[PDB]
Amino acid sequence: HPLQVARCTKIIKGEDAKYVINLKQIAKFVVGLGERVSPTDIEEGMRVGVDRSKYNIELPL
Amino acid sequence: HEKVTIAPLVLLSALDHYERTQTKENKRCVGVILGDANSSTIRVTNSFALPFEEDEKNSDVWFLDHNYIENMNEMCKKINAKEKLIGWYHSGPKLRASDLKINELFKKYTQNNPLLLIVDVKQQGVGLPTDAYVAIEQEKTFLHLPCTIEAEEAEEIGVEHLLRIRLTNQLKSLKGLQSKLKDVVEYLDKVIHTILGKLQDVFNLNNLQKALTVKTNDELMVIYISNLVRSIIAFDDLIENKIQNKKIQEQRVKD
Amino acid sequence: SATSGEAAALGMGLCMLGTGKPEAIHDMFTYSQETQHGNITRGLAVGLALINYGRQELADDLITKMLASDESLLRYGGAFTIALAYAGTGNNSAVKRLLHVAVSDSNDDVRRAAVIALGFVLLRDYTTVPRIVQLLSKSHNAHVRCGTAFALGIACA
Amino acid sequence: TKETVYISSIALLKMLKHGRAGVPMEVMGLMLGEFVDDYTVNVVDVFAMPQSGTGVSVEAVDDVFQAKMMDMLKQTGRDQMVVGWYHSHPGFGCWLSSVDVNTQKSFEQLNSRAVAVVVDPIQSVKGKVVIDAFRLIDTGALINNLEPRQTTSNTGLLNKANIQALIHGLNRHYYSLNIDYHKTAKETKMLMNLHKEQWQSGLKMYDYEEKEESNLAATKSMVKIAEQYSKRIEEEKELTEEELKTRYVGRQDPKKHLSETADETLENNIVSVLTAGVNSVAIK
């Protein structure tokens, strides 16, 4: 299922299990602290993505 | 010098602990002010009470827990980081001998000069229901700093929503000489000059204005010149409205 | 009690109608300032208004205590105390007191309850009723027009 | 009747102080006191909680920090019953807090009459002091007293109410908040005399005397310009109208410029008289 835009809207949790990587020019974010791999759902599932800009350590999805 | 700025949040908070604890005249509620004493402007953004017990039989007997002092100051840091220990406040109309012995307690954890505050629930006479004083030694020497009240934008406006000159100025000015006269007579019989020397400095400084009396009347006439011109402008509208009122009456007769 | 206790204050005032007794005046008034409840005070305020009927100047002792209190709940029912005692033959000083409360006080419910009490005094002569509420019929506050509608309809019904 | 929240003097000021840090950030607190339905509703003391990494959720409140603080409520006379949990949020059109969902549903289990308070403006401050809340209903809460009849409920003309993002549901069921205030005789005596404009008080004579007199020389020159532009407007007003009819879309022409020549004149003369009486008052 191709998805060319991976972004959330006003999602803040905690510290850990926050993520919300935004590819849009406004409010970009990155996730550090080692490697984190999830089988299906990383944070919100669904729109989780990377596309053209690789953000840090997350390959798998 | 320095000035004490008491926010309305602090003044109203100290009045709440008095009624809820059912404090009578035999007890005085003690509390801790929080703010920044570093600059010349001392602002208190937070206040809280403490389990204080007063004993009138012995002025050297007071119950204060230092554990609640350090814990509450540490737990309230999460709200604002600008809140530190600048001093403490207590209740009661007067300063007794028990207040002098408790001044050296908070001085251990206080860097700058601590600040003392007296909250009066009755507010009997003149203004300033809350008086601020500084504790410093060379013998304890207390100085009264100017007491002002300034709050944030939403705090000052919020007071106006909850509440939705010349004669008063002359009454308090006359009582200033009556209260000063009683302080001199009582001090005269108490000794039988240092305290009266400070009052003589203010009392001494058409007596001295005789040289400026001639120039004062000339300036008062110029002020009346502007008032006379503005009065004529208000008089022209009265004749203009009188003619305008007839135009309405002329329409009522024809119609 | 917030339900049955309110009817107790209103139920006693119905048996106390007429001249009444001075003992029930101080007991019902002191209990209002002792225990603080809105419906109980309104039950006492209406109750203290019912216990005084046709007393006129004889009820001025209780009326003064209601006007001196800053509580809006006591001043809400204070107009009905003047209305019932001064009902029928009116007094120039009593009417002046009812008109003075609706001016100085900023409470919308008290200004409304003050002008409604004017109808009970004017029940005999209804010619001056529409003339008093005519000036109050135009105002910036919405609650000013509220009380003038019923007070005009009490006598003219 | 329903429960009409009465905000005390300290209850309103602490809510603005707890949410003082940041526009986007958020805090919480606990309302206290004891009250009975059909009138009495009161909040005695309020206190905040530290901001966690989860924002506002069921895990936001710290029972360890709450239990350690609760023991301090008893010795100070501050101990009361918890009537609810007040929060602070930047606010949205509907559901002002997107991270707050499962809190109130866990709060209604302990007490169904408990509410939650949030400060709406948060930099939007106006001076009507519009504050928002939420309370869940779901099944039940009916077969009881009259909730809507209290204050200006039974509404829905067009869609317009409050923020107008709500209509019927609001958050849930249209709890219909009612915000009033009640104070004792001592608290009302304070803010009346204390709060006016600023503090010169207790003596008005010499405080503003030197400040106003020093600028009186410049004030005399500035009030002259205001009169210069006064008659110039009235001169051109009657010069261009030979008709005395309306083609001029002038529906009220005169009263605007007449008040500008009156109210301004009425403002400038009274400040040069009433202040002049106390500007000397020297006698001996």
UniProtKB/Swiss-Prot annotation, chain A:
Mark the residues carrying the PTM Phosphoserine.
38
Q: How is it modified after translation?
A: The N-terminus is blocked.
Give its localization: Cytoplasm; Nucleus
Name the coiled-coil region(s). Answer: none
Q: Which domain of life is it from?
A: Eukaryota
Give the protein's function: The 26S proteasome is involved in the ATP-dependent degradation of ubiquitinated proteins. The regulatory (or ATPase) complex confers ATP dependency and substrate specificity to the 26S complex.
Protein family according to the UniProt entry: Belongs to the AAA ATPase family.
Extra remark beyond the main annotation: Present with 105 molecules/cell in log phase SD medium.
Q: How does it assemble?
A: Interacts with UBR1 and CIC1.
Listed name of the protein: 26S proteasome regulatory subunit 7 homolog
What does the organism's lineage look like at the top? Answer: Eukaryota, Fungi, Dikarya, Ascomycota, Saccharomycotina
Q: Provide the gene name from the record.
A: RPT1
**What stretch of the parent protein is included here?**
95 to 187 of 467
UniProtKB/Swiss-Prot annotation, chain B:
Protein name as catalogued: 26S proteasome regulatory subunit RPN8
Q: Report the SMART domains cross-referenced here.
A: JAB_MPN
Q: Cellular component GO terms, alphabetically?
A: proteasome complex; proteasome regulatory particle, lid subcomplex; proteasome storage granule
Q: Does the record bear Acetylation in its keywords?
A: yes
Family indicated by similarity: Belongs to the peptidase M67A family.
PANTHER family listed in its UniProt record: 26S PROTEASOME NON-ATPASE REGULATORY SUBUNIT 7, EUKARYOTIC TRANSLATION INITIATION FACTOR 3 SUBUNIT F-RELATED
One of the entry's Gene Ontology molecular-function terms is: metallopeptidase activity
Native organism: Saccharomyces cerevisiae (strain ATCC 204508 / S288c) (Baker's yeast)
Miscellaneous notes: Present with 19800 molecules/cell in log phase SD medium.
Q: Which residues form the MPN domain?
A: 4-138
Its GO biological process annotations read: proteasome-mediated ubiquitin-dependent protein catabolic process; ubiquitin-dependent protein catabolic process
Report which superkingdom the organism of origin falls in: Eukaryota
Keyword line: Acetylation, Phosphoprotein, Proteasome
Biological role stated in the UniProt entry? Acts as a regulatory subunit of the 26S proteasome which is involved in the ATP-dependent degradation of ubiquitinated proteins.
**How is this chain modified after translation?**
N-acetylated by NAT1.
UniProtKB/Swiss-Prot annotation, chain C:
Instruction: Cite the post-translational modification comment.
Output: N-acetylated by NAT1.
TM helices/strands, residue ranges: none
User: Where are the PC-type repeats located?
Assistant: 7-41, 43-76, 77-112, 113-145
What more the UniProt record tells us is: Present with 4750 molecules/cell in log phase SD medium.
Assembly, per entry: Interacts with UBR1.
Could you say which protein family the record assigns here? Belongs to the proteasome subunit S1 family.
Q: What does this protein's UniProt record list under function?
A: Acts as a regulatory subunit of the 26S proteasome which is involved in the ATP-dependent degradation of ubiquitinated proteins.
Quote the protein name from its UniProt record: 26S proteasome regulatory subunit RPN2
UniProtKB/Swiss-Prot annotation, chain D:
Q: Which UniProt keywords apply?
A: Acetylation, Hydrolase, Metal-binding, Metalloprotease, Protease, Proteasome, Thiol protease, Ubl conjugation pathway, Zinc
Q: What cellular component terms from Gene Ontology apply here?
A: cytosol; mitochondrion; nucleus; proteasome complex; proteasome regulatory particle, lid subcomplex; proteasome storage granule
Superkingdom of origin: Eukaryota
Disulfide cysteine pairs (residue numbers): none
Catalysed reaction(s) here are: Thiol-dependent hydrolysis of ester, thioester, amide, peptide and isopeptide bonds formed by the C-terminal Gly of ubiquitin (a 76-residue protein attached to proteins as an intracellular targeting signal)
Enzyme Commission number(s): 3.4.19.12
Q: Which GO terms describe its molecular function?
A: cysteine-type deubiquitinase activity; metal ion binding; metal-dependent deubiquitinase activity; metallopeptidase activity; proteasome binding
Tell me yes or no: is Hydrolase among this UniProt entry's keywords: yes
Report whether Hydrolase shows up as a keyword of the record.
yes
Identify the PANTHER family for this entry.
EUKARYOTIC TRANSLATION INITIATION FACTOR 3 -RELATED
| Domain remark text | The JAMM motif is required for the deubiquitination and degradation of ubiquitinated substrates.
Subunit notes for this chain? Component of the lid subcomplex of the 19S proteasome regulatory particle complex (also named PA700 complex). The 26S proteasome consists of a 20S proteasome core and two 19S regulatory subunits. Interacts directly with RPN8 and STS1.
Write down what this protein is called. Ubiquitin carboxyl-terminal hydrolase RPN11
- What is the scientific name of the source organism? Saccharomyces cerevisiae (strain ATCC 204508 / S288c) (Baker's yeast)
**From which lineage does this chain's organism come?**
Eukaryota, Fungi, Dikarya, Ascomycota, Saccharomycotina
